[PDB]
Structures are given as structure tokens and as C-alpha cells.
Design a protein around this nucleic acid. Structure first.
Ligand SMILES: Nc1ncnc2c1ncn2[C@@H]1O[C@H](COP(=O)(O)OP(=O)(O)NP(=O)(O)O)[C@@H](O)[C@H]1O
Ligand SMILES: Nc1ncnc2c1ncn2[C@@H]1O[C@H](COP(=O)(O)OP(=O)(O)NP(=O)(O)O)[C@@H](O)[C@H]1O
Ligand SMILES: Nc1ncnc2c1ncn2[C@@H]1O[C@H](COP(=O)(O)OP(=O)(O)NP(=O)(O)O)[C@@H](O)[C@H]1O
Ligand SMILES: [Ca+2]
Ligand SMILES: [Ca+2]
Ligand SMILES: [Ca+2]
Lengths: 309, 309, 309
DNA sequence: TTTTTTTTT
DNA sequence: AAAAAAAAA
């Protein structure tokens, strides 16, 4: 896995620590790079890069796996329960582990409350043999009240301070700061294989819609967004972790609500979960663009303690 | 067909295995090569290449076929049904076997669901004397959930594990990795003549729009795309197989949706099928740029089980 | 016409069959050759070529024709109707017979549909005393569906299989293969004087833009293109036939669409017909660079059956 | 000579 | 109802 399996094939140790200084730490890191990105770095020439690709095919052989084998290959994925019964009946165990999940609501619909439950149910050994592990929370608005975890820890009957250390927290302040903070995620995931389970970005579009103006800087903004979602897709295959992202909404005076992000965000997301209000403490949850489950509905209950029934 | 029919015309066996190491395996492989591409390879001189072209015209004679003969020549093409009745009424048997078909939707419109049905209906002996065979699936986003094949296998009344081996799967990770993986397709098609029927690339533009930036690397990206579509056109004549490609969409603040790819992709595609949403589980399918069928519409139904009515 | 009229002027028969092996078949073939091209061939010396030019001026005398005589000299040209009324009102009988015509569209604009009608209307005895004859179709993309001729044969009330033999078909696979296939056209035209009327290349730039890269091989590509267009100009005077060529288009992020080919193709073409989309099954056709008709517009209708009104 | 990208309220 | 930008071989 770690990139020391190449030095027995002609690679000298003088520059294999150099690609570590960019951030590459795994044998799939050279599988997930363009050949011109290794033209940009200080001190690697255009005519020596082929010897790293010499040890790429003879260590990770890109033949043609049959889908029968790929059926047993995909058994390593896991599922995170949401807290309810009909909500992960709507998903099939909840959140997939090799895909990007989206959830958008009006304003009060309980997006971060769904996230705050997921910092608690994901460290408990549950269904599917899922053993539970550590969480990274990348907040961007302000909403990481930690004492809200302590109420949900009671209704699952867990100790308080045993769970307040297994979540990692950092707030981005700028849309470029949100991008560079993904490099710390790659360093944090690699040195402990298997102790982390999922990652939460609070709202990817909470800073992109502010730092960029309207029709002038629109293509500048949508191009920088595509680099972020592609990097998150690479991490979810590199370490087999889940990602959960939310975003805001906007109106439509041309007609009546659409989630912001445009076509770039709608294509790159694997499952989108629409959330609308019902009656009192009840919320309705539809499902948009899923590779499994058709458009059916469920019913939450945001409680004292997150998602219930 | 195989390139051993040339050695009886003066070609020595010392370098006919050399052009095999590039990838050339058929008597049309020398028909589909520039004369300067055989100047680039290690150990073949500029003044000996004519003896391969000596056995080219006396084995494949490029005279002038009349179109009456070409009418009976084109009877070897086949047609893949999609799953509906009005949808291949809109196409005339469905997918052609010597052409490139395109299909683009908004985001939830069911592009990969149309692909997932085509991995099932193409191995069943159907209309036009089409006997069915094996499929190659080149995925690029992430969407190859194999258990979705098992639902569609029921509504055609086929065994489960008899069809999960006749599809081959590989995921490209990089836009250059997608190009070199076509060379494995040529090796896989050649050694078994007639057991493969079609090929699916998931989304050719899913990695080209990410790995390349805006107006700086635009001409660099569009030139590398033209090498890919021309290689796919050569394979579809070399082995008589069908190809099915999808792509994303983009907006237009100059006006209102256009499929990405530019003029290069729009010219090289033979039929393009627009897909838009109707009501509930119904989708509308128009047709763009076809050499037969004029602009008429139909109506899907994505079901439990892919395309219905 | 045939080169046996020279042997009565001192030319021995030992080498007049030699210039036949290059491809020269007519008395204008020595009028259309450089004197250094007859230095390159195996077995003809630099000091004997003048005796062929001895019988050149005393058989084709290059004096000074007056334009009054040239007015009656040019009566042998003919005109091919396209299928509409305002479209050849825009051209003046349609396609000239001693010139190169060009037509370029966006992607769906009906370029090959205009070609498919021209394989049918050119074998019918129509206006101007044009008697009709045989057609050569040099396809290069893939688009020669022959059953599309059978629909247009009905709306002109012609037999089906009487017209499916008078069109000759060949597909080029490589940009050098497209060049050498013009030598078969010269052999096919010469032995039957007057039974052929026109020639269609599908898209000259469909293979030149693929087989050659960007700014490296640009001058290499544009030099090889100029040899092709000059050879086509020589054939259209050697046998008095029409030629119809199409090409793709490209964008312009420096500004917004331009036809590809550069200045070489724009100069060597005699008439260029721009094609853009109107409403539904209607197309608008402007005219670029014509030696007659000024910039006026018309309106097609691609039908069941090609071009209508 | 060559090559199009990008929704917001 | 109504808004604009961005370059490399
Ligand atoms: N302990 C609690 N008991 C009952 N309701 C609660 C409790 N805590 C929070 N809520 C409610 O849960 C909702 C919070 O949803 P929330 O996810 O915070 O919205 P949001 O995602 O933050 N949208 P926005 O605040 O505009 O960014 C509100 O209706 C709160 O009143
Ligand atoms: N098991 C199933 N049975 C029937 N229909 C299903 C099934 N699972 C998914 N679908 C349908 O598939 C639709 C989404 O189709 P999909 O092919 O994912 O479009 P898509 O454009 O490829 N999504 P994306 O990859 O983000 O662009 C859903 O809206 C469902 O209607
Ligand atoms: N026989 C026919 N009957 C009905 N409609 C037709 C017929 N032939 C063509 N069309 C319509 O005309 C369009 C095809 O135009 P076409 O002449 O193929 O453009 P093109 O520029 O040759 N395509 P491309 O090679 O991709 O650039 C399609 O959108 C069809 O709907
Ligand atoms: Ca919030
Ligand atoms: Ca998809
Ligand atoms: Ca065409």
C-alpha cells in the first residue's frame, strides 16, 4: 500500500520522498494522477516519469475484472445507519461508503441535526458488521455546538467523554482554505488505516456563493468547484470512507426552488436527499437521483436527540 | 484476418511479431494506419515499410464497390433493443453496430439506467437474428452497482449467475488511463471473433472536463479527445461492434442547456438521443442528429427493472 | 485524347506505356505536369523529355483564345439541380461542372442529406440538356446508408435497383489512403468518357484534423492538403466533372464559428455554402465566396426524402 | 492555425 | 426581468 514497494524495481530513494512532499502516500496515488501533474513539480523531469509507471502495472495490474468477481470485491463497503427505521429503509442501510451523498433543505429543515446524529451513530458497532471508527468534521458556517452530541449520546446509552475525542474538527474560513484543508485529510487518513470511517463537510456551497460574484466570476467559481468534488471522489476510493455533504437552496422567479451548485454538483453527487417540513416536529424526506432507490418518501422526527420516528 | 497472410509474400517473421507488440492484430490494421506512424516505432526504417503495403492491395483490394453490392454488404450489422417499444421504434431496432451513439440528460434523467438495461438485453437472442454475446463496460464515474442487473434479469426471465460473467468491467481513474485502456479492448476483441457484441463507455467527458482547465488547456484537451473518438470509430469497423457513450450537460448565461464536448464530439457522433424528464417515473426522449430518424419523441418508464413503458 | 497521338511524331512505344504506369492517360496529362516530376520516375532521363513536349504544342496549341470564343467554349459545362427551387435560384442551376463546391454546417444541419439527394438527382435527365450519368462517392466518416436513397427514388418516381448500381462507393481509412484513392478515380474516369458526371468526397478535413497534431505538425498537414485540392482541380478539367466537398466547423474563444481548413481550403474552393438551422425541419442556407451570386439566403426542408421546400 | 466554458435571485 | 467574463501552445 505505502510507496516503498517501488524501490525494489529501480526507483532510487532520493526522489520517492519528494512525491511524499506533494502528498502522495499510497500505491493508488500514482494510479490517480495525470502524467502532466508530474511535469509541474520542482525537480522531476519529463523523461524520467516512466519508471514509476513501470512499477504501476506490475504491482496494480489493470486487466479486466469480471463482474462476478466484482460482486465479491464490493463486499468491503459498509453502511452507516441514520437513526430512524424508514429513512434507511429508503436508503438500504443508510450511507454508502464509496460515494458522495447530498442533502438539501429549505432553511429550518434539520440538515446539521442529521449531521450531528451521524457523528454518534457512526462510532457504534451496528448492522452489516460495521465496527465504527473516527470522524472528521469540516465545518464551514458556524454550527458545531458540541453539547448537542451529549444529548444523543444518552439515547444510545454511550459514555460522554468516550465519544468526544473520536471526532476531529476544523473550520474553513475561505473557499481556498476549504480546498487546501483536504490535504490534511489525506495525511490524517493514511497513517492510520481503518480507524476512520467517514467525513462530513458542512456546506460546500456556503463559501463559494459568497467569495464569487454573479455572471462575471461564474465560470471561475464552477471550475474551482469541480476540482474539489473530484478530489473528494478520489479520497473515498483511496481509503474507503463515506462523505456527507449539504448545501443551501435558491428560488426561481422564472416560473419553484432549486438547490444551488448547478449541473456540476448535480452530476458528481451519487445520492441526493430532499428534505421538506411536515407538521410540528415532523419532516418529510424524498430522494433525488439515486442509483438504487426510487422516489419514495419517509418521515423524520427531530427530537430531543436528533433523528427519531 | 490475422496477420500471418503476409509472410507468403516476402515478409520475414522477425518483425511481424514486432507490429504485434504495438497492438496491430488484423489485416485491416495496416489499412487503418498512417505511413508516418510506422516511422515512430523502435527498429523499423523509413525505406522498408512498402513491402507490407505490397501485400495490402493484393489481399484487400481497394477498387470501387457498387452500392448495390454495398446494400448486401451491410447486412452483417445488427441491432440491440433497448427495452421499450416506441424507443426502438424511434431508432429502428435500437443501436446500430457500426456507429457511435450518444445520450445526454439533465442530471437524474436515467442515463446509466439505460446502460444497465443494455448489459442485459444484449446477451439475449432477439430480433433481426441477433444472437447475443459478451459486453465490456468501461466505467468512469462510479456507477456500476451489479445487483441492479439482477432485478432486470428477472423481468426477462434469465438465470442470475449465467449473465454476471459475460460482462467485463474496468474503471478508469485518469483521462490518459481511459485512452490506454482501449488497447486492452483490442487485445480482448481479437482473440475471440464474434463472442463480443458491444462496448459501453460511461461518460467520456467526465474526466476530460476535470483534468483540464479553462481557456488555457482547452485546445490541449480537445486535441486529446479527437484521438479517442477516432480510435473508437476504428474499433467499431475492425470487429463490427456497437458503442454507447453518455455525457453531462452545461448551462448558458449568454441567452438554455447544451451538451459538453463542443464541435468535436457533436460531429463524430452518429446519433444523439436527448433525454428530459416528464412526470413521476416517465421520461421523454427526443433525437438529435440522426442519419435516419427525424425529430420525434417517445416516452420511457424507469421502473423496478430499467426501461419499460 | 488518349496518348497514342504522339508516336507518329518520333515517340517510341517502349516508354509511352511507362507513363501509363504512373497514371497519365490523356493528351492534357502532359499539359498538367511539371518538368521535374518527369525527372523522378525510374528510367526516364533529364535529356529526353523534350520530345514529348515536341508533340504537345503541335497537338494542343497554347495561343491566345479570345473571350468571345471562350464564351462559346464554356457551353459544355452542365448544372446539377439540388432538389429545391430557391436553392438553385441561389446558385443558378445548382452545381457548376468545372469548379469545387463547399458546404459546411454546425452539426445537425444536413450536410450528408444534401449529398444523398445529389446521388439521385444527378442521374435524371434534367434542365440545361443535362443527361445524367454515374457517380463516385468517397465516404470518410461512416455515413453511406444506402436505403436512404430508396426513399428519395420514390419522390422522383424512379426504379429502385436501376439507380443502386450507378453510384460507386469506397471508404478511406487514413489521410494518405484518401490521397492514393484519387488515382483509381483517374483510371475509372478515363476508360469511359462521358458516363460519369460528378464526384463526392464526404469530408476532406475529417481525417486531416485527426492524423495530425497541433502546432507541431500543422505545416506538415497544410502542405499535404494543398496537394489534394490541386489534384481535384486538375481532374475537374481533365474529364469535365463536378466535385462536392463538405467539412466540419470549429469555435473561437478569441472573440464565433469558423470552418476548418485555414486559408488553403478557403482560397482553393470556388463556392462555399453556409448552412444553419431554422425552425423544426427548416434550414437556412447563405452563400460565401461565390464568383457569381451575392450574399442572399434561402430555406430548405429536409423531409422524408432529402431536400424539399 | 487551433480550440469553448459557466447559473444566479 | 436581467445581468460578463476568461489564453495557451
Ligand atoms: N433540542 C432540540 N429540540 C427540538 N428542536 C430542536 C432542538 N435543537 C434543534 N432543534 C430544531 O431543529 C432545527 C435545526 O435545523 P438545522 O439543521 O439547524 O437547520 P440548518 O441546517 O442550520 N439551516 P440554516 O440554520 O439556515 O443553516 C430547528 O427547527 C431547531 O429549532
Ligand atoms: N432499483 C431501481 N429500480 C428502478 N429504477 C431505479 C432503480 N434505482 C434507480 N432507479 C432510477 O434511476 C434514476 C436515476 O438514474 P441515473 O441513471 O442515475 O441518472 P443519472 O443521470 O446517471 N444520475 P447521475 O450519474 O448523477 O447523472 C432514479 O431517479 C430512479 O428512478
Ligand atoms: N431520411 C430522413 N428522414 C427524416 N429525417 C432525416 C432524414 N435524413 C436526415 N434527417 C434529419 O436531418 C438530420 C441529419 O442531418 P445530417 O445531414 O446527417 O447532418 P450532418 O452534418 O451530416 N451530421 P454530422 O456528420 O454529425 O455532422 C437529422 O437530425 C434527421 O432528423
Ligand atoms: Ca446549518
Ligand atoms: Ca450516472
Ligand atoms: Ca454527416
Amino acid at each position: 500500500q505505502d510507496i516503498d514497494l517501488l524501490q525494489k524495481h529501480g526507483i532510487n530513494v532520493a526522489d520517492i520522498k519528494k512525491l511524499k512532499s506533494v502528498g502522495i502516500c499510497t500505491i493508488k496515488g500514482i494510479q490517480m494522477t495525470t502524467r502532466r501533474a508530474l511535469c509541474n513539480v520542482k525537480g522531476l523531469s519529463e523523461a524520467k516519469v516512466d519508471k514509476i509507471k513501470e512499477a504501476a502495472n506490475k504491482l496494480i495490474e489493470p486487466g479486466f475484472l469480471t463482474a462476478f468477481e466484482y460482486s465479491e470485491k464490493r463486499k468491503m463497503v459498509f453502511h452507516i445507519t441514520t437513526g430512524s427505521q424508514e429513512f434507511d429503509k429508503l436508503l438500504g442501510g443508510g450511507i454508502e461508503s464509496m460515494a458522495i451523498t447530498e442533502a438539501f433543505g429549505e432553511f429550518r429543515t434539520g440538515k446539521t441535526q442529521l449531521s450531528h446524529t451521524l457523528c454518534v451513530t457512526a462510532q457504534l458497532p451496528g448492522a452489516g458488521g460495521y465496527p465504527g471508527g473516527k470522524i472528521i468534521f469540516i465545518d464551514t458556517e458556524n454550527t458545531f455546538r458540541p453539547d448537542r452530541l451529549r444529548d444523543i449520546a444518552d439515547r444510545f446509552n454511550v459514555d460522554h467523554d468516550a465519544v468526544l475525542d473520536n471526532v476531529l474538527y476544523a473550520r474553513a474560513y475561505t473557499s481556498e482554505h476549504q480546498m487546501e484543508l483536504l490535504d490534511y485529510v489525506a495525511a490524517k487518513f493514511h497513517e492510520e488505516a481503518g480507524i476512520f470511517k467517514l467525513l462530513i463537510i458542512d456546506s460546500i456551497m456556503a463559501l463559494f456563493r459568497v467569495d464569487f460574484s454573479g455572471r462575471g466570476e461564474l465560470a471561475e467559481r464552477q471550475q474551482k468547484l469541480a476540482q474539489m468534488l473530484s478530489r473528494l471522489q478520489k479520497i473515498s476510493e483511496e481509503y474507503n470512507v463515506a462523505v456527507f455533504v449539504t448545501n443551501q437552496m435558491t428560488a426561481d422567479p422564472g416560473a419553484p426552488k432549486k438547490p444551488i451548485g448547478g449541473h456540476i454538483l448535480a452530476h458528481a453527487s451519487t445520492t441526493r436527499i430532499s428534505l421538506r417540513k411536515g407538521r410540528g416536529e415532523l419532516r418529510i424526506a424524498k430522494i433525488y437521483d439515486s442509483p438504487e432507490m426510487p422516489e419514495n418518501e419517509a418521515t423524520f422526527a427531530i427530537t430531543a436527540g436528533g433523528i427519531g420516528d
